[PDB]
Each structure stands twice: as C-alpha cells, then as structure tokens.
Design an enzyme around this catalytic site. Structure first.
Site, PDB file in Angstrom:
ATOM      1  N   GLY A 142       0.812  -1.199   0.000  1.00  9.45           N
ATOM      2  CA  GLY A 142       0.000   0.000   0.000  1.00  9.45           C
ATOM      3  C   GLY A 142       0.850   1.255   0.000  1.00  9.45           C
ATOM      4  O   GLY A 142       2.083   1.221  -0.061  1.00  9.45           O
TER       5      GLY A 142
ATOM      6  N   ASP B 292      -2.066 -10.857  -1.856  1.00  4.77           N
ATOM      7  CA  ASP B 292      -2.164  -9.751  -2.801  1.00  4.77           C
ATOM      8  C   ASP B 292      -0.988  -8.820  -2.539  1.00  4.77           C
ATOM      9  O   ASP B 292      -0.718  -8.469  -1.384  1.00  4.77           O
ATOM     10  CB  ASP B 292      -3.489  -9.011  -2.590  1.00  4.77           C
ATOM     11  CG  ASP B 292      -3.619  -7.775  -3.449  1.00  4.77           C
ATOM     12  OD1 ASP B 292      -3.530  -7.872  -4.688  1.00  4.77           O
ATOM     13  OD2 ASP B 292      -3.826  -6.692  -2.881  1.00  4.77           O
TER      14      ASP B 292
ATOM     15  N   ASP C 121       0.733  -5.224  -3.115  1.00  4.02           N
ATOM     16  CA  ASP C 121       0.428  -3.845  -3.480  1.00  4.02           C
ATOM     17  C   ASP C 121       1.669  -2.965  -3.382  1.00  4.02           C
ATOM     18  O   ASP C 121       1.702  -2.006  -2.608  1.00  4.02           O
ATOM     19  CB  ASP C 121      -0.695  -3.275  -2.600  1.00  4.02           C
ATOM     20  CG  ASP C 121      -2.017  -4.041  -2.746  1.00  4.02           C
ATOM     21  OD1 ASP C 121      -2.109  -4.972  -3.585  1.00  4.02           O
ATOM     22  OD2 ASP C 121      -2.982  -3.705  -2.027  1.00  4.02           O
TER      23      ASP C 121
ATOM     24  N   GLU D  60       3.794  -0.100  -4.438  1.00  3.55           N
ATOM     25  CA  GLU D  60       3.556   1.134  -5.172  1.00  3.55           C
ATOM     26  C   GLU D  60       4.797   2.016  -5.201  1.00  3.55           C
ATOM     27  O   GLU D  60       4.947   2.878  -4.336  1.00  3.55           O
ATOM     28  CB  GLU D  60       2.411   1.903  -4.524  1.00  3.55           C
ATOM     29  CG  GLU D  60       1.110   1.124  -4.472  1.00  3.55           C
ATOM     30  CD  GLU D  60      -0.040   2.032  -4.149  1.00  3.55           C
ATOM     31  OE1 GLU D  60      -0.538   2.703  -5.076  1.00  3.55           O
ATOM     32  OE2 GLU D  60      -0.423   2.109  -2.968  1.00  3.55           O
TER      33      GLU D  60
ATOM     34  N   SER E  49      -7.499   1.985 -11.412  1.00  6.79           N
ATOM     35  CA  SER E  49      -8.006   2.923 -12.413  1.00  6.79           C
ATOM     36  C   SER E  49      -8.805   4.034 -11.735  1.00  6.79           C
ATOM     37  O   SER E  49     -10.013   4.193 -11.929  1.00  6.79           O
ATOM     38  CB  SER E  49      -8.849   2.181 -13.440  1.00  6.79           C
ATOM     39  OG  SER E  49      -9.796   1.346 -12.792  1.00  6.79           O
ATOM     40  N   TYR E  50      -8.091   4.800 -10.920  1.00  4.89           N
ATOM     41  CA  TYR E  50      -8.662   5.901 -10.156  1.00  4.89           C
ATOM     42  C   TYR E  50      -7.494   6.770  -9.693  1.00  4.89           C
ATOM     43  O   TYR E  50      -6.342   6.509 -10.038  1.00  4.89           O
ATOM     44  CB  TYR E  50      -9.582   5.386  -9.033  1.00  4.89           C
ATOM     45  CG  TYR E  50      -9.110   4.174  -8.238  1.00  4.89           C
ATOM     46  CD1 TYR E  50      -7.870   4.162  -7.596  1.00  4.89           C
ATOM     47  CD2 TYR E  50      -9.946   3.068  -8.068  1.00  4.89           C
ATOM     48  CE1 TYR E  50      -7.461   3.066  -6.835  1.00  4.89           C
ATOM     49  CE2 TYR E  50      -9.546   1.969  -7.305  1.00  4.89           C
ATOM     50  CZ  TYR E  50      -8.315   1.988  -6.685  1.00  4.89           C
ATOM     51  OH  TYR E  50      -7.928   0.903  -5.926  1.00  4.89           O
TER      52      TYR E  50
HETATM   53  C1  LIG Z   1      -1.559  10.477  -5.426  1.00  7.11           C
HETATM   54  C2  LIG Z   1      -2.587   9.434  -4.971  1.00  7.11           C
HETATM   55  O1  LIG Z   1      -2.225   9.013  -3.681  1.00  7.11           O
HETATM   56  C3  LIG Z   1      -2.924   7.946  -3.105  1.00  7.11           C
HETATM   57  C4  LIG Z   1      -4.074   7.259  -3.825  1.00  7.11           C
HETATM   58  C5  LIG Z   1      -4.705   6.253  -3.257  1.00  7.11           C
HETATM   59  C6  LIG Z   1      -4.300   5.761  -1.883  1.00  7.11           C
HETATM   60  C7  LIG Z   1      -5.016   4.572  -1.212  1.00  7.11           C
HETATM   61  C8  LIG Z   1      -5.355   4.993   0.199  1.00  7.11           C
HETATM   62  C9  LIG Z   1      -6.042   5.757   1.079  1.00  7.11           C
HETATM   63  C10 LIG Z   1      -7.200   6.678   0.648  1.00  7.11           C
HETATM   64  C11 LIG Z   1      -7.748   6.615  -0.764  1.00  7.11           C
HETATM   65  C12 LIG Z   1      -8.779   7.357  -1.126  1.00  7.11           C
HETATM   66  C13 LIG Z   1      -9.447   8.279  -0.119  1.00  7.11           C
HETATM   67  C14 LIG Z   1      -8.992   8.331   1.123  1.00  7.11           C
HETATM   68  C15 LIG Z   1      -7.816   7.460   1.524  1.00  7.11           C
HETATM   69  O2  LIG Z   1      -7.361   7.537   2.837  1.00  7.11           O
HETATM   70  N1  LIG Z   1      -5.866   5.722   2.347  1.00  7.11           N
HETATM   71  N2  LIG Z   1      -4.793   4.755   2.515  1.00  7.11           N
HETATM   72  C16 LIG Z   1      -4.481   4.283   1.016  1.00  7.11           C
HETATM   73  C17 LIG Z   1      -3.578   3.366   0.213  1.00  7.11           C
HETATM   74  O3  LIG Z   1      -2.725   2.634   0.642  1.00  7.11           O
HETATM   75  N3  LIG Z   1      -3.997   3.564  -1.128  1.00  7.11           N
HETATM   76  C18 LIG Z   1      -3.354   2.906  -2.237  1.00  7.11           C
HETATM   77  C19 LIG Z   1      -4.113   1.712  -2.785  1.00  7.11           C
HETATM   78  C20 LIG Z   1      -3.744   0.428  -2.492  1.00  7.11           C
HETATM   79  C21 LIG Z   1      -4.433  -0.645  -3.028  1.00  7.11           C
HETATM   80  C22 LIG Z   1      -5.511  -0.381  -3.882  1.00  7.11           C
HETATM   81  N4  LIG Z   1      -5.866   0.887  -4.169  1.00  7.11           N
HETATM   82  C23 LIG Z   1      -5.182   1.892  -3.632  1.00  7.11           C
HETATM   83  C24 LIG Z   1      -3.299   6.368  -1.260  1.00  7.11           C
HETATM   84  C25 LIG Z   1      -2.560   7.527  -1.911  1.00  7.11           C
END
Ligand SMILES: CCOc1ccc([C@@H]2c3c(-c4ccccc4O)n[nH]c3C(=O)N2Cc2cccnc2)cc1
Length: 380
Positions: A86, A124, A126, A128, A195-196
């Site tokens: 994550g 899984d 993740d 990043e 995809s977001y």
């Molecule tokens: C520049 C974009 O920066 C980010 C985009 C997305 C995340 C999301 C998220 C959130 C969060 C996401 C949306 C709204 C409020 C939130 O707190 N909170 N902790 C996590 C995490 O680890 N994420 C990653 C992830 C991992 C696996 C599958 N999908 C996404 C983090 C940063």
C-alpha cells in the site's frame, strides 16, 4: 463468473459515528473476494500484522483477521486475501525484499505461513511501485516464485493453492517503468487495476478521480489518464482481459476553487475543505457527498468522462455514484473485462445512513453485485 473483489481497510474502524466501519458491516454476496488492507513486513522481510488490533488480544478481542474471515460462515462463496504493501508502506522495503532469490524466499515462505495461520485464501501484493529495470525484473521473479511456492504448499498439504494477485498502476509512465507485463501475466490469478486517482488535490488542475474516458475539457497531455485507456493499456501489453479487474472508487476527490464562478472541469483550485468523517484534505466519502446534495449542492453529469461532479459554493467534488457505477458495469460487460473491484467497502453508504437513502445497503457496490453478480443486496 465475474470477479467482484472489495477492499476492507483495518483503519476504518477508527472513524467516528456513522462512519465507523467494522467487518460485521459486510453483507453476504456483496463481494466475491475481500482484500484485507494491509498486512505488513519486518525489516528482515518476514511478515507481521500492520495493526496490533488485527490479531486476537486482550484489548481488541477476536481481532480483525478473525472477524473478516468469520464473514465466510454466512457468505460461503466468499474468499479473502491479505494485501501486503500500500501507499504508506512505500517502496524501500519492497526493493530490499525483492533483491535476490534468498530475500524473496524469506518473504514468500513467511507470507504463505501467515495467511494459512490467519485464514486467508490468497496473497495480494500492493507494491507502489516497482520502478526501473532492477525492480521490474525482481518483481517478475517475486510473482513467479510466489506462485511456485503456493503451488508447492498446495501439493504438500493437499489444499487448494493460495491465490496470487496485485494492485497495479494505471498510469502509462508508471506501468512502463515497473511492469514487464508479458512475464507477469502467467503468474497472477488476476490484477486489481488502480483505475482511479487520476486527478486530485495534490495538483491545482481540477479534474476527475476516475473518468471512464478522457474529456476534451481537460488538457490533451492527460488523454491516457482514464479508466478505459488504462485497461486497454494493460491488455495491449499482454494481460488477458479476464485477468483485468477494473477499479471502482467509492470515495471522491475535491478542490477549493480559485474562482467560485469558474466551475468547469479543467479549472484550478487548492484542496477541498477537510470532510467531517474522512478527515483528509481533498478526499471524501460517498456518504458525505449524499448529504452535500441533500443540503443543496448542484450535481452535474460529465457526458464525455461519464462521471458526476458537484459544486457547493467554492467546493468542487469529483465522485462516483449509482449512475456512474451502472454505466461502468455496462462497460465492463461490453468490453469483456474480468470484473470490477472497490476501494473501499467503508466509503460507500454501507449502513444506508444517507438522508436520501431508499434503504439500500451499499448503494454503489450493490450496482456491481447486481449487474455483474446477479445478487440483490437487501435494504436495511
Ligand atoms: C496520489 C494518490 O495518492 C494515493 C491514492 C490512493 C491511496 C489509497 C489509500 C487511502 C485513501 C484513498 C482514497 C481516499 C482516502 C484514503 O485515505 N488511504 N490509505 C491508502 C492506500 O494505501 N492507497 C493505495 C491503494 C492500495 C491498493 C488499492 N488501491 C489503492 C493512497 C494515496
């Protein structure tokens, strides 16, 4: 059968009031798979719980691992996976863990034992993000060696083998720098395409969190930053469509407009006001947006990108709703992708608390359950 995963987050239980989310807020059939965000890793690459409250203990009780896995008692088709990594986890520990056969083996063996101990059906990853030729080859080796060790554990014990999946980048530059797709595809059961987060409050450009397609309202340099471009990209690079699980957000992303009279997609702003329950500048939950609308925010539908936005004074929010979920499910079926997954269970109106609710639990995720799964999620 379409694959319908959903992310559970172990920190949503710390939100206040109507936003507090625990595993027992799940309802049967809502998802085919629950991904548990997140498992963690020690400096020596062995795995451990991220939150001490994941484990049974004196102050937490049964713990979130057991409470999530107990959901399988009343949803017998449900499978669970533990997600390692994550955003907060970062890259340095993955880069070290993946460096050699020996370092990867420490993690692989530890993860397999850990998920079996705590009752999960899959692992899984993740990360990043892997980036550079070294990470790219090490990530290929990690996924290949992980699947092989899962096959070995299954043959040894006679059980069905653990699933191997990953949440993966949607941006072309990040994909190119980190993912050797033809050498990854054979070893994943499926991928969770992120995809977001295409546009957001880290930048001043006001755009859409998860536009299905590009819009001419936004600068052409971003024409690949949308759901369909990212799914096509993974498929063209070698991932079969049945393994591409399209990402669906139940949160939104928002700005304080620089000029409240300039409300077009493509305008400029700074982060939106922090919302009451999410407490994170520039994001909010569906169950917050529903109240904004009830309270008089104006809703617009973007026809090119096929997602809504709302304007409340100087606040401009890109979000997703039942209507955008329905059009995205038509897209998944029409284009032949393997399913759709949700970030997260806890940002939908999971308890039907919205002032404008018709009683439907999970108004957004219920669209996936119905259109892809034939499952009718009940009213509260
Ligand atoms: C520049 C974009 O920066 C980010 C985009 C997305 C995340 C999301 C998220 C959130 C969060 C996401 C949306 C709204 C409020 C939130 O707190 N909170 N902790 C996590 C995490 O680890 N994420 C990653 C992830 C991992 C696996 C599958 N999908 C996404 C983090 C940063």
């Amino acid at each position: 059968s379409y694959i319908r995963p959903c992310y559970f987050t172990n920190w949503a239980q710390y939100r206040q009031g109507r936003a507090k989310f625990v595993p027992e807020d799940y309802t049967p059939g809502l998802c085919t798979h629950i991904l548990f965000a997140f498992g963690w890793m020690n400096a020596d690459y062995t795995v451990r719980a991220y939150d001490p409250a994941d484990l049974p203990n004196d102050w937490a009780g049964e713990g979130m691992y057991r409470r999530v896995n107990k959901l399988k008692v009343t949803d017998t088709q449900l499978k669970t996976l533990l997600s390692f990594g994550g955003w907060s986890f970062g890259t340095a520990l993955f880069q070290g863990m993946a460096a050699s056969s020996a370092s990867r083996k420490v993690f692989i063996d530890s993860a397999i034992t850990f998920v079996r101990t705590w009752g999960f059906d899959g692992i899984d990853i993740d990360w990043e993000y892997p980036s550079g030729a070294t990470d790219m080859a090490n990530y290929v080796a990690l996924v290949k060696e992980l699947k092989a060790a899962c096959e070995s554990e299954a043959g040894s014990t006679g059980k069905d083998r653990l699933l191997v999946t990953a949440a993966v980048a949607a941006g072309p530059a990040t994909i190119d720098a980190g993912y050797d797709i033809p050498n990854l595809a054979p070893n994943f059961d499926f991928i969770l395409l992120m995809s977001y987060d295409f546009f957001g409050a880290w930048a001043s450009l006001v755009g859409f969190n998860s536009p299905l397609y590009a819009t001419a309202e936004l600068p052409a340099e971003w024409n690949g930053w949308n759901v369909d471009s990212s799914a096509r990209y993974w498929n063209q690079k070698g991932m079969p469509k049945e393994k591409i699980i399209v990402g669906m957000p139940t949160y939104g992303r928002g700005w304080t407009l620089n000029n409240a009279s300039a409300i077009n997609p493509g305008t400029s702003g700074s982060p939106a006001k922090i919302t009451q329950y999410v407490q994170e500048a520039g994001v909010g939950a569906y169950f917050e947006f529903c109240e904004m609308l009830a309270n008089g925010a104006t809703r617009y539908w973007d026809s090119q990108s096929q997602v809504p936005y709302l304007v409340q004074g100087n606040q401009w929010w890109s979000y997703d709703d039942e209507e955008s979920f329905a059009n995205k499910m038509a897209y998944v079926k029409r284009e032949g992708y393997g399913g759709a997954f949700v970030w997260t269970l806890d940002f939908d109106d999971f308890n039907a608390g919205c002032s404008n609710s018709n009683g439907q639990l999970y108004p957004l995720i219920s669209v996936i359950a119905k259109e892809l799964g034939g499952v009718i999620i009940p009213k509260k």
